[PDB]
Structure formats: C-alpha cells, structure tokens
Amino acid sequence: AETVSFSWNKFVPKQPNMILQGDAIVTSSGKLQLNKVDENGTPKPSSLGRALYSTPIHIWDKETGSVASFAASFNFTFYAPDTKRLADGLAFFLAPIDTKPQTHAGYLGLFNENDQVVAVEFDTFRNSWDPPNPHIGINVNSIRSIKTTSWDLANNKVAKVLITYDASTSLLVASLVYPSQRTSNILSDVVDLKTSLPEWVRIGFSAATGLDIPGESHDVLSWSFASNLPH
Amino acid sequence: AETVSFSWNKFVPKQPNMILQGDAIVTSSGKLQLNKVDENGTPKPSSLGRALYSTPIHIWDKETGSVASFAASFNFTFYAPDTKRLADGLAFFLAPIDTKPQTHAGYLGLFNENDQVVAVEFDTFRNSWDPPNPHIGINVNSIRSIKTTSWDLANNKVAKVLITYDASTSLLVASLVYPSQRTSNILSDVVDLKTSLPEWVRIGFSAATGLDIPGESHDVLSWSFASNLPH
Amino acid sequence: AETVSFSWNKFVPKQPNMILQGDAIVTSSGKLQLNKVDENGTPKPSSLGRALYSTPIHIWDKETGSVASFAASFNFTFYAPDTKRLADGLAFFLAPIDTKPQTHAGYLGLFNENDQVVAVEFDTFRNSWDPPNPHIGINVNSIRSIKTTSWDLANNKVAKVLITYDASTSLLVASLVYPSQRTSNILSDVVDLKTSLPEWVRIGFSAATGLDIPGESHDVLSWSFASNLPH
Amino acid sequence: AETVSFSWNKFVPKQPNMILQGDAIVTSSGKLQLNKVDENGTPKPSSLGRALYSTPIHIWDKETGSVASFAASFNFTFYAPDTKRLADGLAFFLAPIDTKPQTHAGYLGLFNENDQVVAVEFDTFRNSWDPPNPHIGINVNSIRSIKTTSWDLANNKVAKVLITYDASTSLLVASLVYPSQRTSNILSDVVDLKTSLPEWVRIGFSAATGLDIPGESHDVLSWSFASNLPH
Ligand SMILES: [Ca+2]
Ligand SMILES: [Ca+2]
Ligand SMILES: [Ca+2]
Ligand SMILES: [Ca+2]
Ligand SMILES: [Mn+2]
Ligand SMILES: [Mn+2]
Ligand SMILES: [Mn+2]
Ligand SMILES: [Mn+2]
Structure with missing residues (x-):
C-alpha cells in the first residue's frame, strides 16, 4: 500500500519540507508562528499565515477505489491580549496541491464568499454562520461547519490535538486536550x-487574526502525521 | 528503553497469550465474551468475567524513576435485553501480576468493600457512589471514580475506545466512539x-452483570496495545 | 492480523518476561549471561544456559494457512580464554511452548543424539557433522545444518545479528556484523x-561451553523482535 | 527528533512524490524503469535514468552535531540481452537537493571525470578502477569504491536489497538477496x-546502460525508507 509518516518535536527555520504562506514563519526558538506580532508580543489585526507540508499525499486512488486512513497530531497555543475580544482562529486541513490562500479573518484563509477543502477549525469568533x-x-468543502462542539x-x-480518519467508516474524529487544565x-x-477532495x-x-482587532496569535509547536493507503 | 506491542483483529479460542478468569471465555466466532449468557442470548445475573494479557508490563522503574507511556484500543459492545434495567458494566485496567478477581456486580470485579488498581470504567448502573x-x-486505587463523564x-x-497515558504530564485520557451514531x-x-501501581x-x-438482574452482556472484539519505557 | 513486538537496550535481573534455563542468568550490569564463569571471568566446561521469551508466538495458523513473518536482532559477544581452543557455541531459535533443554556441548542444548526445532547457530567447534x-x-528440525557459511x-x-523470515518466499536470512572490524x-x-514447527x-x-574445556563464554546484551501474522 | 518514512508496493505513473530524471520513467505496469528499452524489450546503449524522492531529508544537524540513522529497501531486476556483455549498473544514493545527473555509462550518472555523493553501487562492468x-x-564522495564485494x-x-546506516558507529551495511536462488x-x-554530505x-x-552496447535494463519495483534524527 502507500505509506508515509513524519514527526518533529521542533520547527527548523528555513526547513525545505514545510512550505510557508502569508505571514507564516518559523522562529529561532522553534515555533511555527502563523500570524504577525508586535515586538511587544502583540498580535496585529488583519494578519493571516498558512503552512504546508511539501510531499503530497495520496489520499485516495481512482483506479482501485481505495481510501486512506490517517492521523495527525499537534501542540499549539494562542496568545490573546484581550480575552473578551477574540478572533479569528486556526484550522488544520487538506487541500489540493496548488492551494494558495483564500479569504482572511473569519474565513481562516480557507474559503471565499463564493475551493475543495476539508478542514477542522478551532473558531474563536462568532460569525454569521x-x-x-x-x-x-x-x-x-465549506465554512459552515457540518458539526461543532464547544x-x-x-x-x-498548551493544547494537544488529535485527528483521525477511519476510511472504514468514513468517520473523522477530533480531540483536543489541555493537560495544563486536565480539560x-x-x-x-x-x-x-x-x-470532497x-x-x-x-x-x-x-x-x-482579527480583521479589525488584534484578537490572538496562533503558534504551532509540534507536528505528527501518518497515512495508509491500502490496495 | 522498553518496548512492547500487540494487536488482534479477532480472538482465538484457547490462545496461550490471554489469561481467562471467571465466566470469561473466547467464542468460536472470535469474541471475548466476558459474562455468561442464555442460549436465548440473554445475560445471566450475578455473572462476572475478567481477562488478562500474559506478558507483564514494566510500567515504571524504581532505580531510574522512569515512567511508561502507553496506549490501548478496543472494539466492544454490550447486549441489554431490557434497556430500562442495566448493570453493571465493564472496565479496562491494570493491576499487579497475581491479580485475581475481587467483588462482583457494582465492583466490576475490581474492588472489594474494604487492591492496587488503576482503571477506566464504563459504568451502567447508579450505585451509591x-x-x-x-x-x-x-x-x-478505588471504586469511587476521581472523574467521570456521561x-x-x-x-x-460497536464502540471504539481509546486510552492514552502520557508519562510527561501524568495525564490519562479516555475516549469512546460510536461510529454507528457518529457519537x-x-x-x-x-x-x-x-x-498507585x-x-x-x-x-x-x-x-x-446485574447482581439480581440480567442487565447486559459485555463482549470485546479487538485489542491493541503498546508501551514505551524510556531510561 | 496478529502482531507482537518487543525491544530491550539492557536486561533486568529477575524480569518476569524472560524465562531462564540451566546456567542462564541476568547480571546486575545488564547482560544475559548464558554460560557459567569463574570469578577470574573464565568459562567453565560442560556449562549450558537457555533463555526464553514468555509470551508465545503464533507463528502460523492452521485454519487459515497463514504464516508469520518475523525478525529479530541482538548484540552479543563471547569470551574465549584460549582462542586456539573454542567451543561450543550459541543458537537463536524457536521451539514449542514447553521446551526444555536437550543435549549440551556440541548440541547447543537444542538437539539430542536420537525435538521440533528451527534454529540459527553460530558454531565454534568442528563436530563430526x-x-x-x-x-x-x-x-x-536437526543439528546437521542445511546451509552454512563461514x-x-x-x-x-560486539556482534550485531539480524534474522529475517519472509513468509512470502519462505526465505530465512541471517546476517552478522562486527562494526568494530567493519566485518x-x-x-x-x-x-x-x-x-517444522x-x-x-x-x-x-x-x-x-566446552564439554571438556572452557571454550568461550556467551553473553547477550540486547534483544529485538517483531512478528506479523496476516489472515 | 526528526522522523520520516515512506513505503510503496508499486510505482504510480506521474506520481508527484518521485522526481524523474533522464530516461527514467514509470510504467503502467508499475515499474520504475530507469533505462530506455526497445519495443523488443531490448536495452539501448548510452541510456541513463535517475529518480529522486521529493521531500528532502535532514540527514544531520549542524547546531546539535546529531546524525541520522536510516534504512532503505528495494526489489529490483535487470534485463541483459547478452550476459557475456554487461554494463553498466545501478546505484542507490544520496546527494544534495539540487542534484542533477553527472556522467553516464561507467559513472552511473553519479560522478564526473574531475560532486558530494554517497552511494552504494551494483557495478556490472569492469572499468579501470x-x-x-x-x-x-x-x-x-567518489567513483572508486572504498570497499567492494562480489x-x-x-x-x-528479483533482488531484494537492504541498506542500513547506523549513526552510532558510522557503519553502513548493504545486503542483497536472490530468494529465487537462495543467494x-x-x-x-x-x-x-x-x-561527505x-x-x-x-x-x-x-x-x-552500455556506452557502446545495450548491456542491461535496470527496473526498480518497490521502495522503502525511514530515517531518525535524534536531538
Ligand atoms: Ca467564526
Ligand atoms: Ca455503578
Ligand atoms: Ca560444532
Ligand atoms: Ca564498472
Ligand atoms: Mn465556525
Ligand atoms: Mn461509577
Ligand atoms: Mn554446526
Ligand atoms: Mn565499481
């Protein structure tokens, strides 16, 4: 079948395996820093970063009908200068090879008001939908979540997230954990x-970040992934 | 470090790797059937099975302070002839090498009213605690859960369960999923x-099963496990 | 399918996963020491140790015809007080659950002159066969090797050995390496x-060890194993 | 640390993970066909293909001194129309990101008479060196092998090859096996x-292929790889 996996405890600046978009960049410290921030550490409104993994993933095969299974994990935080005022969020996702960024703020750089995406979002800000x-x-394939949970x-x-997709049932599962809060x-x-892909x-x-407010920074600290595409 | 893993898609009757206790037994069909049931398929009250994995697990090391990390998964169902009347449940656990069964019904064969156990229970019946x-x-190390959730x-x-223990934080996490119900x-x-161990x-x-009622059968269909004990 | 694996960087004395036979014992230092030796460090003639791994291995399945694949690795040395005079050797092997030791010296505790074994031997001493x-x-299933190599x-x-068995071809392969000697x-x-099993x-x-001479000590330092039994 | 792995049982034509060079191409049948061949199936002289894996590999880290370990396996054949007349061969290797092909025939597209390569060659033809x-x-870093073996x-x-590099000793090991011939x-x-990299x-x-003769075709059927870069 087809197999791939990768794992990082830290991000290496200027690493030839990740592809950076927008404001997205990797710090010396080793963080994947998605959004732009002030020397004061503050987030800057109307900011938007994306970050891809170079090798492409054969998720499903047309000749054989076969569908992959896969799983991904990451350590991530966010910094909000004013917790009464947040936005806009972070998503993990899968798109097509030549994906460039869509709309910002409430679209998390994924959708536009009027392009072949599956994603799991962690939305901070209550939009219309x-x-x-x-x-x-x-x-x-849309910004209006098919399911949500608080x-x-x-x-x-630090949040530890885990995402799994079980080809057998076509069941996607996402879990988030704050060990700091036993949450x-x-x-x-x-x-x-x-x-859909x-x-x-x-x-x-x-x-x-916030369209018209700072909102919150979004840094990713670790990344793990593996996939299996049976014949 | 110390590593172990195992994985079964089915149970083989009379397999020399599992140790059966009480009413616990493996069917031809391939199920680990924990509790006793009528030819009519019905559960029989005051029933109680346990099931162990032969090789022992070095969970932590005294000289080096080291603590394992581990994870386990299983497919399991239960059969309840009358859903208004359930009891008593199923637990996954870890105990000491020479563990034999404790009290039944509401103690899930794990504790006694007055022995070094860590467990995750799936309790059907509202006891005093x-x-x-x-x-x-x-x-x-007790039947009064330190935390619960509905x-x-x-x-x-079919329920798919996943249990993880992260030595780094001493954070245990359990998740259950009904793909059938997208739950x-x-x-x-x-x-x-x-x-505690x-x-x-x-x-x-x-x-x-029920002390004085049938309650529900408890069969386990698959088992997966892995552990890591760094130095 | 059926999966198992284990890995140790060191041996823990009195570990409940290994089963010791004969002179076989685990040192404080962490070595699996197979044969008996003098305080002077010398091997003692007519010595013989064996060492098993508790969980049993489902190598093949009768109903389904299925055959496992597997692989094993180990770091091992030997100590010979007089290199002109060696014997008798070391084997890795697989036998039936209730295997106890056979003949010693030239039989490497595996065969007798007149019991269901597959093994890879590292023979130091030129016997009749x-x-x-x-x-x-x-x-x-015999002491007369079906194939050999210098x-x-x-x-x-330190020798690093690797053994692989490929169910697909029924091809067993053994390799040995002295990194110390780039050999x-x-x-x-x-x-x-x-x-055959x-x-x-x-x-x-x-x-x-030597029947009538010390020959050489045989210590094992690490062990690794994994198996897969498809359906 | 840094981890990567991949595995294919077959090659998918026009797969976005492999990079093809020269005559190198992937067939419908699923073979990585390195050299050019006649409809008659014959190899064509002065042919030369190369084939890369898109994601780059962090083999060692400057700040931390750390060195990866890695392993690779492949199923490969060759077709020689006249076995008395062979050339020139096949190599597996590692080079720098922007590597393009060097000299052909006896240089296996790796070196030139007068560029930062480590490789394992399977040479068919007796050149000057x-x-x-x-x-x-x-x-x-040269075409004059530091070690060889028949x-x-x-x-x-079908040949099954296995390559391992053990950072611990800086010991590279290559083995080849003809299960067909138990060789x-x-x-x-x-x-x-x-x-050196x-x-x-x-x-x-x-x-x-042969500079002035057909020599032999060189097709690769499977590929497996994994690496680990400790901190
Ligand atoms: Ca929103
Ligand atoms: Ca209860
Ligand atoms: Ca001999
Ligand atoms: Ca040559
Ligand atoms: Mn939303
Ligand atoms: Mn309870
Ligand atoms: Mn022999
Ligand atoms: Mn050569």
Whole structure:
C-alpha cells in the first residue's frame, strides 16, 4: 500500500519540507508562528499565515477505489491580549496541491464568499454562520461547519490535538486536550473524501487574526502525521 | 528503553497469550465474551468475567524513576435485553501480576468493600457512589471514580475506545466512539503511577452483570496495545 | 492480523518476561549471561544456559494457512580464554511452548543424539557433522545444518545479528556484523514452518561451553523482535 | 527528533512524490524503469535514468552535531540481452537537493571525470578502477569504491536489497538477496556523513546502460525508507 509518516518535536527555520504562506514563519526558538506580532508580543489585526507540508499525499486512488486512513497530531497555543475580544482562529486541513490562500479573518484563509477543502477549525469568533462560543468544527468543502462542539479554551496554555480518519467508516474524529487544565473536547462526524477532495492533496495549517482587532496569535509547536493507503 | 506491542483483529479460542478468569471465555466466532449468557442470548445475573494479557508490563522503574507511556484500543459492545434495567458494566485496567478477581456486580470485579488498581470504567448502573446516568470514569486505587463523564451509550452498537497515558504530564485520557451514531465522549485527568501501581503490572478487562438482574452482556472484539519505557 | 513486538537496550535481573534455563542468568550490569564463569571471568566446561521469551508466538495458523513473518536482532559477544581452543557455541531459535533443554556441548542444548526445532547457530567447534571453521548455520528440525557459511569471528568484540523470515518466499536470512572490524557475513535458505514447527512457539537463545574445556563464554546484551501474522 | 518514512508496493505513473530524471520513467505496469528499452524489450546503449524522492531529508544537524540513522529497501531486476556483455549498473544514493545527473555509462550518472555523493553501487562492468567481476561497492564522495564485494548476480531474477546506516558507529551495511536462488551478499564499511554530505539531502537511484552496447535494463519495483534524527 502507500505509506508515509513524519514527526518533529521542533520547527527548523528555513526547513525545505514545510512550505510557508502569508505571514507564516518559523522562529529561532522553534515555533511555527502563523500570524504577525508586535515586538511587544502583540498580535496585529488583519494578519493571516498558512503552512504546508511539501510531499503530497495520496489520499485516495481512482483506479482501485481505495481510501486512506490517517492521523495527525499537534501542540499549539494562542496568545490573546484581550480575552473578551477574540478572533479569528486556526484550522488544520487538506487541500489540493496548488492551494494558495483564500479569504482572511473569519474565513481562516480557507474559503471565499463564493475551493475543495476539508478542514477542522478551532473558531474563536462568532460569525454569521457560527454557533455560540468557541468551538471546534468540521468543514467539508465549506465554512459552515457540518458539526461543532464547544471548545473549552485557555489562553497561553498548551493544547494537544488529535485527528483521525477511519476510511472504514468514513468517520473523522477530533480531540483536543489541555493537560495544563486536565480539560478535553471531542467531535466526530462522517466525511466522504472520494467526493470532497482529490486523489492527491497537501496538508497544513491556516490561522487568522482579527480583521479589525488584534484578537490572538496562533503558534504551532509540534507536528505528527501518518497515512495508509491500502490496495 | 522498553518496548512492547500487540494487536488482534479477532480472538482465538484457547490462545496461550490471554489469561481467562471467571465466566470469561473466547467464542468460536472470535469474541471475548466476558459474562455468561442464555442460549436465548440473554445475560445471566450475578455473572462476572475478567481477562488478562500474559506478558507483564514494566510500567515504571524504581532505580531510574522512569515512567511508561502507553496506549490501548478496543472494539466492544454490550447486549441489554431490557434497556430500562442495566448493570453493571465493564472496565479496562491494570493491576499487579497475581491479580485475581475481587467483588462482583457494582465492583466490576475490581474492588472489594474494604487492591492496587488503576482503571477506566464504563459504568451502567447508579450505585451509591455513582453520579447520575451512565458514565465513564477513572478509578485510581478505588471504586469511587476521581472523574467521570456521561457516556452516551447505544445498545448492541460497536464502540471504539481509546486510552492514552502520557508519562510527561501524568495525564490519562479516555475516549469512546460510536461510529454507528457518529457519537463521542472524552474524559481526562492526571494519575500517578509511581504511587498507585507496581513497577510491573498486567492488563486486561473486567465486566459484570446485574447482581439480581440480567442487565447486559459485555463482549470485546479487538485489542491493541503498546508501551514505551524510556531510561 | 496478529502482531507482537518487543525491544530491550539492557536486561533486568529477575524480569518476569524472560524465562531462564540451566546456567542462564541476568547480571546486575545488564547482560544475559548464558554460560557459567569463574570469578577470574573464565568459562567453565560442560556449562549450558537457555533463555526464553514468555509470551508465545503464533507463528502460523492452521485454519487459515497463514504464516508469520518475523525478525529479530541482538548484540552479543563471547569470551574465549584460549582462542586456539573454542567451543561450543550459541543458537537463536524457536521451539514449542514447553521446551526444555536437550543435549549440551556440541548440541547447543537444542538437539539430542536420537525435538521440533528451527534454529540459527553460530558454531565454534568442528563436530563430526561440521564443516571446517566457525560457521553460521540453519538447522531445520536437526543439528546437521542445511546451509552454512563461514563466520568471521572476533573475540571479545560486539556482534550485531539480524534474522529475517519472509513468509512470502519462505526465505530465512541471517546476517552478522562486527562494526568494530567493519566485518560481515550472510547466510540464506528457504525453510518451511508449517511443517517444522507448531502453530505457537516460543523463542530464545541457547549456548554451550566446552564439554571438556572452557571454550568461550556467551553473553547477550540486547534483544529485538517483531512478528506479523496476516489472515 | 526528526522522523520520516515512506513505503510503496508499486510505482504510480506521474506520481508527484518521485522526481524523474533522464530516461527514467514509470510504467503502467508499475515499474520504475530507469533505462530506455526497445519495443523488443531490448536495452539501448548510452541510456541513463535517475529518480529522486521529493521531500528532502535532514540527514544531520549542524547546531546539535546529531546524525541520522536510516534504512532503505528495494526489489529490483535487470534485463541483459547478452550476459557475456554487461554494463553498466545501478546505484542507490544520496546527494544534495539540487542534484542533477553527472556522467553516464561507467559513472552511473553519479560522478564526473574531475560532486558530494554517497552511494552504494551494483557495478556490472569492469572499468579501470574496478575490481574483477560484478560487485557491490560503497562510494564515498567518489567513483572508486572504498570497499567492494562480489555480487552474485542473476539475470531477470528479483533482488531484494537492504541498506542500513547506523549513526552510532558510522557503519553502513548493504545486503542483497536472490530468494529465487537462495543467494546472498553483504558488504559493510564506515562512512562519515557529517563530512561527505550536507545537512539536507535527497535520495534516489541512478542507472546506466552500455556506452557502446545495450548491456542491461535496470527496473526498480518497490521502495522503502525511514530515517531518525535524534536531538
Ligand atoms: Ca467564526
Ligand atoms: Ca455503578
Ligand atoms: Ca560444532
Ligand atoms: Ca564498472
Ligand atoms: Mn465556525
Ligand atoms: Mn461509577
Ligand atoms: Mn554446526
Ligand atoms: Mn565499481
């Protein structure tokens, strides 16, 4: 079958395996820093970074019908200078090889008002299509999440996320954990790949600050991934 | 370091790697059937099976302070002839090498009213120390769960469970999923091994029917496990 | 399918996963010491230790015809007080669950002059059925190796061995390496399991000193193993 | 640390993970076909293909001194229309990111008469610097192998190769196996990466036909790889 995996405890600046977009950049310290921030450490409004993984992923195969299974994990935080005023969020996702960034702020650089994406979002800001409070969601080829759940967030604290997709059931599952707070959320729903994405995709993250406010920074510290594409 | 892993898609009757206790037995079909049932398929009250994995697990090391990390997964169902009347449940756990079964019914063969166990229970029946409704819990050296969460159960449907223990934080996390229902629960809390168990343990399951009612059968279909004990 | 794996960088004295036989014992230092030795460090003639791994291994399945694949690695040395006078050797092997030791000296505790073993031997001493010089051999249900190759040995130096069995071809392959000497041997031949062993076996090592001379000590420092039994 | 792995049972034509050079191309059948061949199936002289793996590999790290370990395996054949007349061979290797092909025929597209390569060659043709007979060799930053061993080749038969590099000893080991012939060769020597390659490299294969004769075709059927870069 087809196999791939990768794992990093830290990010190496100017690493030839990640592809950076927008404001996205890797620090000396070793963080994937998605959004732009002030020397004061403050986030800057209307910011938006994306970050891809160079090798492409054969997610499903047309001749054989075969569908991959896969899993991904990451350590991430966010910094919010004013917790009463957040936005806009962070997503993990999969798109097509030549994906460039869409709309910002509430679109988390993924969708536009009027392009073949599957994603899991961690939304901080209640848009028109949003539910109340921060949440986690599954976006299948659209920004209006097909399912959501509250997101019990904590500022400046480390979140450990885990995403799994089980080809067998077409069941995607996302869980988030604040060990710092012994806190946990889970969300699950079925998604069909064979019809919402292309045989080969690329993966990564997207994150966006407030359109008209700073909102919160979005740094990613670790990344892990593996996939299996049976014949 | 120390490594171990194992994985089964099915159970082989009379397999020399699992140790059966009580009513516990493996069917031809390939199920680990924990509790006793009528030819009519019905569960029989005051039933109780346990099931262990032969090789012992070096969970932590005294000389070096080192603590393992580990993870386990399983497919399991339960059969309840009358869903208004359930009990008593199923636990996954770790105990000491020479562990034999404790009390039944509400003790899930793990504790006695007055012995060095860490477990995750899926309790169906509201005992004195229980919270309302079915739940999932973390029992550290006792039957009174240190944390719980609702358990969104479904009769006769397949549940996929995942348990992880992260030595780094001493954070144990349990999640359950009904893909059949696109349903999900998670529970997390910190637990100290070095003080609630012995350097070497054995793992397995325990399950129990109604004391005075049939309650529900408890079959396990798959098992997966892996551990890492750094130096 | 069926999976198992284990890995140790060191041996823990009195570990409940290994089963010791004969003179076999684990030192404080962390070595699996197979044969008996003088305080002077000298080997003692007519010595013989064996060492097993507790969990049993489902090597092949009768109902389904399925055959495992597997691989094993180890760091081992030998100490010879007089290199002109060696014997008798070390083997790695697989036998049936209830295997106890056979004949010593030239039988490496595996065979008797007149019991269901597959093994790879590292023979130091030219017996009647031996080829000239030290060698490596594949013994299928007998002490008369079906194939051999020279063994370019070095006293007191670390050897890294690797053994692989490819169910697909029934091809067993053994390689030995002295990184200290940038030295290497390989041997390969086909072996049928389904007819030379039982569905379930146990694995381990066997080693033996000179019958009437000290010969050489045989210590094992690390062990690694993994198996896969498809359906 | 840094981890990567990949595995293919077959090659997918026009796959976005492999980079093709020269005559190198992937067939419908699923073979990586390195050299050009006649409809009659014949190889064509002065042919030369190379093939790379897109993601780059962090082989060693300057700040931390750290060196990777790695391993690779492949199924490969060659077709020789006239076995008395062979050339020129196949190599596996690692080079720098922007590597393009060097000289052909006896240089296996790797070196030029007067560029930072480590490779393992399977040479069919006795050049000026060659030893007698086909052989296997380790080329550290040059075409004159630092070590060789006979290569017991068989035309049109499947060879299974395995390459390992153990950072701990700086010991590279290569083994080749013809299960069809129950045949085996091994070669090992120490190599310093930190001084013969760049922190980041790319890997692949190179293969070349006769300069003035057809020689032999060189197809690769499978590929496997994994690396670990500790901190
Ligand atoms: Ca929103
Ligand atoms: Ca209860
Ligand atoms: Ca002998
Ligand atoms: Ca040559
Ligand atoms: Mn949303
Ligand atoms: Mn309870
Ligand atoms: Mn012999
Ligand atoms: Mn050469």
